[PDB]
């Protein structure tokens, strides 16, 4: 569900 590319620092 969450997009890993929304913020690459997470």
């Amino acid at each position: 569900n969450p997009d890993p590319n929304a913020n690459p620092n997470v």
Partner: antibody, heavy 120, light 114 residues
Framework: VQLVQSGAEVKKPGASVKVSCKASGYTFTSYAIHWVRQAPGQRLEWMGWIKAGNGNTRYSQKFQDRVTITRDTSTTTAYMELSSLRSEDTAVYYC??????????????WGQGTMVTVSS | DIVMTQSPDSLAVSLGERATINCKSSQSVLYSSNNKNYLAWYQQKPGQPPNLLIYWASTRQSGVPDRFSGSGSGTDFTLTISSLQAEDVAVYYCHQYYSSPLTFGGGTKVEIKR
């Protein structure tokens, strides 16, 4: 663990601006630097990020055509260039290490902000 | 576009009283496989950049005083200041890093009643 942005500028409608973000105090190539803008009265507004290591970028849909983020690994610096400047573009432009949440480390650092005014 | 909505827009309380800020995300911020909420809270004093207070919905960042706590899950989230001190005057933003584009709420201004 610091981010230092260039000074405030004024440009003519249609011109371009090139803000910079100098980083230090941490491994520069390990994390991505975002660009966020705070217009007067508006909520914070994400523009895009760049992976400091390999230079890959993602841009918000609102700024696809006019934004370009870059970086120079030697000087530890990221840049954000905005072209075709308009009245709405008067805002403070931040660079930030947004929520670096890794198993080893957890921090969040913002540049002090660069006020850009679009005016003749 | 996850729209972050905060309630109220302005909060005014006496020194030492409890203060609570509400954030409602338009879709769920929970990933059920790892049971984490992709939500943070920021503080912004005037003339300064935002300051990260809480991440993973409830995890406080080292350095932040204990009186700041976050809670909630899914689409409803609360930021509590258990005892408001004078320097807590500021605007408080929730922030979701669940979906692209990253988004912030509209901010909540906290004022002291004196």
């Amino acid at each position: 663990v610091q981010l230092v942005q260039s000074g405030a500028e004024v440009k003519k409608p249609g011109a371009s601006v090139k803000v910079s973000c100098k980083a230090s105090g941490y491994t520069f190539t390990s994390y991505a630097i975002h660009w966020v803008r705070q217009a007067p009265g508006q909520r914070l507004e994400w523009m895009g990020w760049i992976k400091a290591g390999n230079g890959n970028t993602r841009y918000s849909q609102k700024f696809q055509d006019r934004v370009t983020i870059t970086r120079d690994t030697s000087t530890t610096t990221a840049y954000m260039e905005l072209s075709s400047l308009r009245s709405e573009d008067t805002a403070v432009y931040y660079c930030a290490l947004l929520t670096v949440l890794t198993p080893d480390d957890a921090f969040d650092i913002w540049g002090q902000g660069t006020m850009v005014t679009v005016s003749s | 576009d996850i729209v972050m909505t905060q309630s109220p827009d302005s909060l005014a309380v006496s020194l030492g009283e409890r203060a609570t800020i509400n954030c409602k995300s338009s879709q769920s911020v929970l990933y059920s496989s790892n049971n984490k909420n992709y939500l943070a809270w920021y503080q912004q004093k005037p003339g300064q950049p935002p300051n990260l207070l809480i991440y993973w919905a409830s995890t406080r960042q080292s350095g932040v005083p204990d009186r700041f706590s976050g809670s909630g899950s899914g689409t409803d989230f609360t930021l509590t200041i258990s005892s408001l001190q004078a320097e807590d005057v500021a605007v408080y933003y929730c922030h979701q890093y669940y979906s692209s584009p990253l988004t912030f709420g509209g901010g909540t201004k906290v004022e002291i009643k004196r």
